[PDB]
Amino acid sequence: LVRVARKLDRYSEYGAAVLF
């Protein structure tokens, strides 16, 4: 994941494809 930004960013798209 990207370091400077996560929220509303990258963990969003992966999280919703992997977790949700």
HSE (side-chain half, CA atoms, 13 Å) at 15: 8
Residues 6+ apart with CB under 8 A from 14: 1
Identify the residue whose tokens are 């960013």. 9
**Distances in Å between the alpha carbon of 7 and those of 2, 15, 18?**
10, 11, 16
Please state, in angstroms and rounded to a whole number, the distance separating the CA atoms of residues 1 and 14: 9
Q: Are 8 and 14 in contact (CB under 8 A)?
A: no
3's tokens: 């370091």
Q: What are phi and psi of 8, to 5 degrees?
A: 60, 20
Q: Are 1 and 10 in contact (CB under 8 A)?
A: yes
12's tokens: 């969003």
